[PDB]
Structures are given as C-alpha cells and as structure tokens.
Amino acid sequence: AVIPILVIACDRSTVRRCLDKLLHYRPSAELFPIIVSQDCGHEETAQVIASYGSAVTHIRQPDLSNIAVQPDHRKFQGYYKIARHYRWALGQIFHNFNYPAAVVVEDDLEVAPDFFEYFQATYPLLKADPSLWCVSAWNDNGKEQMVDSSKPELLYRTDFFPGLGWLLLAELWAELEPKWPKAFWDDWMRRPEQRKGRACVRPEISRTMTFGRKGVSHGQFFDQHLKFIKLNQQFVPFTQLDLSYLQQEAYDRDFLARVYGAPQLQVEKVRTNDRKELGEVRVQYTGRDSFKAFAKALGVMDDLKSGVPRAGYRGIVTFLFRGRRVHLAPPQTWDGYDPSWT
Ligand SMILES: O=c1ccn([C@@H]2O[C@H](COP(=O)(O)OP(=O)(O)O[C@H]3O[C@H](CO)[C@@H](O)[C@H](O)[C@H]3O)[C@@H](O)[C@H]2O)c(=O)[nH]1
Ligand SMILES: [Mn+2]
C-alpha cells in the first residue's frame, strides 16, 4: 500500500529541516509520496517548499479568511486555523488523492533514521487490529534519562493519543471528518466520544523530535517538556521483527501480567534508587492526588486529558528511572478512565 507523508506547513521556512530529513531517509518515493499542504500563504515558506521540485507535491489550503471564534476563544484564533487546515489537508489525502492511509507530520518535526521502517512495519498491525486507531512516533515521556537506549526496538500500546508523527487509516478519517471540531483537534480526539477506548502504538524511543520553539502556542510547554524528547538515532529494522506482541489479545494478557507481577516499591525508594536489585517495579497510585504527586516525584508528565495520563495504558505509565523500569500504575481493580481527574 502507498502511505503518503502529509507535511502540514504554514509560515516557518524551517520546514526545510523537516523535508530534508524526510527526503534523506525515505526508502522509496513510490511507497512514500510526500505531500506538503501549506496554509497561511507565507511566500518565503512557499518558495522553500517549491524549491524541492518533484521531490514533493505542494498543495495550498484555499481559504485564508479569518475565522469567527466563540466568545471564550478570542486569544485562540490560531487553533481554529490549525483545525481548518487539518480538515482540508486530510480531506485532500483521502478524498482527492484517495490514499488508504497517511502519516501526518507537522513542519517542525525532525524524523528518526527508521521513521519509514517503523510505519512500514506497523501499518499491517493497525490494518488488522480494530482496537488500535493509530501508530505514533512520539513517546510523551521520552526524555533521554527516561528511556532504555539498549531497547530502541521496544514498542507499547497507549490510550493517550500522542500525535506528533502519526499514522491513521482512511477508515478513521471517514469516522472523524463528519464531526471534526472548530478548534483544539488533538484534545478533541483524546475525548472518549472520539477515542472509543482505542489505543495507539508508541515507541520506547521517539521517532520524531520537535524543534519548533516559536509556534501558534506560547512556549512554556515546548520549553519545559517537548524540547527534551530524544530522537532515536539507532536504526531498528522493524519490518524484520515479530510485532505480534502488540495485538490486543497478547498485550493485555502479557504486558499486564508483567506489570502486576512486578514488585511494588515505595516512590521514595525508587526516587533515591534504593533496592537496586529490583530492576523492574510498580509504583501504585490510588487517586488523582497520589498520581500527580508520584508522577512529579519521578519526573513523568503529570497532566491528564479526559482522565488519561501521558503515555498511559489502562492507567499505567511505563518509563525508565535511573536505569530502572518503573510502572506507575493504579490498583489491578482499574476499570476505566475518569474524566474528572483533571
Ligand atoms: O494558521 C496556522 C498555524 C499553524 N498551522 C500548522 O499547525 C501545526 C502546529 O502549529 P504550531 O505552531 O507548531 O503549534 P503547536 O503549539 O505545536 O500546536 C499544538 O496543538 C496543535 C492543535 O491545536 C497540534 O496540531 C500540534 O501538533 C500541537 O503541537 C504546524 O504543522 C503548522 O504549520 C496551520 O496549519 N495554520
Ligand atoms: Mn509545533
């Protein structure tokens, strides 16, 4: 199947860094056509994209008019424009170009050497397991000291939609387009009304990194969190690996058994690196206050979207802490997310 890479651009000429890496690693022009959809009408950015010639297909969002926002959103016009562009660009990919799937990449993302290999290998999983609705290149807790550099091949399922370099099927666009929101499209997909309990595949080591400090949003989130996610640099031949462990029936039995079979250790002991003979442990949280407390104590992202923690799966957040595998998890009686955990 032909899987286009849809690059979303606007007014940053640094889309050059994004395209340079994509084109450098692309293993096949036929299998991975690059379509750059540009919003905004920024001339310099338009010239940069055009300079790539036939290496890419340059399409332009047609409606550059200002958008009438709701009363609570005067400061958020940019988020409305992003949502409009996504609807148009994805519509072009699935309706005009009629591709079966697409990998969405924002102009300020740099891809890893094995970005294409990763999606080539996981497309079949997504196509075969309806409990999955995406494959993302992003590990929300992917800071260098929180990932195992000796396991660049390790993948997980996550209930938290990461975006930032993600694959979706035309089947999903058919589902989302009729109800596409006016703004904040990513947080909208994180709601249960959209997710419907489905997961995404995400890696131990992120296959994308962001360099867009200046953007639509102010920079605190990027400055304190996003900019620290480490880009994988060790090529993993995913298409040669057995990724059957990611199928829901295998994962929910094996990964959960692993998590709850692991010894529980007090957060303070993990933090101070006590009991090092325990290479893999579980730090149990029982409420919203213990979760945020323990998350912050261990350096994990502590915000929640519709009650789901970053990179969480059945409430479990998995990461590395001072060389130890840690599973920040709820009691095994867990049975659903609570959106009131804010
Ligand atoms: O008028 C605009 C402005 C931006 N963009 C594009 O939107 C994307 C995100 O813009 P950016 O300035 O980088 O903002 P972020 O703060 O990074 O936006 C966050 O929130 C967005 C949804 O509101 C998500 O799409 C992003 O992935 C998420 O990082 C990029 O591909 C831009 O080219 C447009 O299409 N039109
Ligand atoms: Mn950005």
Q: Last residue of some domain: 181, 200, 226?
A: 226
Query: Would you call 186 a catalytic residue per the annotation?
Result: yes
- Residue that is written with structure tokens 């997504």 in the block: 126
If phi over 0 gives left and psi between -120 and 50 gives alpha, with beta otherwise, what is residue 117? alpha
Shared-domain flag, residues 198 and 292 = no
Shared-domain flag, residues 136 and 210 = yes
Shared-domain flag, residues 50 and 184 = yes
Report d(CA 74, CA 52) in Å as an integer.
37
**Measuring from atom 17 of ligand 1, which residue has the nearest CA?**
215
255: in domain: no
Shared-domain flag, residues 277 and 213 = no
Measured from the CA of 221, which atom of ligand 1 is nearest?
A: 16
For residue 155, the CA-to-ligand 2 centroid distance in Å is 24
234: in domain: no
What CA–CA distances, in Å, run from 69 to 38, 60, 181, 183, 316? 22, 23, 12, 9, 37
**Measuring from atom 5 of ligand 1, which residue has the nearest CA?**
82
**Measuring from atom 34 of ligand 1, which residue has the nearest CA?**
82
- Residue 274 is labelled as binding a ligand: no
Report d(CA 64, CA 10) in Å as an integer.
11
Residue 209 phi, psi dihedral angles, 5° rounding: -145, 150
Q: Last residue of some domain: 180, 202, 226?
A: 226
Instruction: Please choose, from the candidates 241, 110, 88, 85, the residue with its C-alpha nearest in 3D space to the C-alpha of residue 165.
Output: 110
Shared-domain flag, residues 271 and 209 = no
Report d(CA 320, CA 253) in Å as an integer.
22
- Residue that is written with structure tokens 């995913």 in the block: 238
**Measuring from atom 36 of ligand 1, which residue has the nearest CA?**
82
Shared-domain flag, residues 272 and 184 = no
251: in domain: no
Residue 270 phi, psi dihedral angles, 5° rounding: -65, -45
235: in domain: no
Ligand closest to the CA atom of residue 107: 1
- Residue 12 is labelled as binding a ligand: yes
89: in domain: yes
Report d(CA 248, CA 192) in Å as an integer.
19
Shared-domain flag, residues 203 and 284 = no
CATH number, position 336: 3.10.180.20
Shared-domain flag, residues 125 and 222 = yes
Instruction: Domain of residue 43: give its range.
Output: 1-226
Report d(CA 109, CA 14) in Å as an integer.
10
Instruction: Please tell me the experimental approach by which this structure was elucidated.
Output: X-ray
Instruction: Please choose, from the candidates 87, 102, 89, the residue with its C-alpha nearest in 3D space to the C-alpha of residue 167.
Output: 102
Report d(CA 77, CA 70) in Å as an integer.
10
In SS3 terms, the chain reads as: CCCCEEEEECCCCCHHHHHHHHHHHCCCCCCCCEEEEECCCCHHHHHHHHCCHHHCEEEECCCCCCCCCCCCCHHHHHHHHHHHHHHHHHHHHHHHCCCCEEEEEECCEEECCCHHHHHHHHHHHHHHCCCEEEEECCCCCCEHHHCCCCCCCCEEEECCCCCCCEEEEHHHHHHHHHHCCCCCHHHHHCCHHHHCCCEEEEECCCCEEECCCCCCCCCHHHHHCHHHECCCCCCCCHHHCCCHHHCHHHHHHHHHHHHHHCCECCHHHHHCCCCCCCCEEEEECCCHHHHHHHHHHCCCCCCEECCEECCCECCEEEEEECCEEEEEECCCCCCCCCCCCC
For residue 164, the CA-to-ligand 2 centroid distance in Å is 9
28: in domain: yes
For residue 215, the CA-to-ligand 1 centroid distance in Å is 7
CA dihedral 189, 193, 194, 198 (to 10 degrees): 110
249: in domain: no
Q: Last residue of some domain: 226, 243, 272?
A: 226
CATH number, position 215: 3.90.550.10
Shared-domain flag, residues 145 and 272 = no
Residues having CB within 6 Å of any atom of ligand 1: 8-10, 39-40, 78-79, 81-82, 85, 106-108, 163-164, 184-186, 212, 215-217
Q: Which of 186, 187, 252, 302 is catalytic?
A: 186
Shared-domain flag, residues 133 and 33 = yes
CB 123 within 8 Å of CB 3: yes
Ligand closest to the CA atom of residue 39: 1
236: in domain: no
- Residue 72 is labelled as binding a ligand: no
Measured from the CA of 214, which atom of ligand 1 is nearest?
A: 12
5-9/101-106 β-pairing:
parallel
For residue 32, the CA-to-ligand 1 centroid distance in Å is 23
Shared-domain flag, residues 7 and 156 = yes
Extract the tokens encoding 50: 């055009």
For residue 184, the CA-to-ligand 1 centroid distance in Å is 10
**Measuring from atom 24 of ligand 1, which residue has the nearest CA?**
186
How many independent structural domains does the chain possess?
Answer: 2
155-158/324-329 β-pairing:
unpaired
Of 7, 65, 86, 106, best ligand 1 pocket probe by most atoms within 8 Å of the beta carbon: 106
Ligand closest to the CA atom of residue 73: 1
Shared-domain flag, residues 110 and 160 = yes
Report d(CA 162, CA 139) in Å as an integer.
7
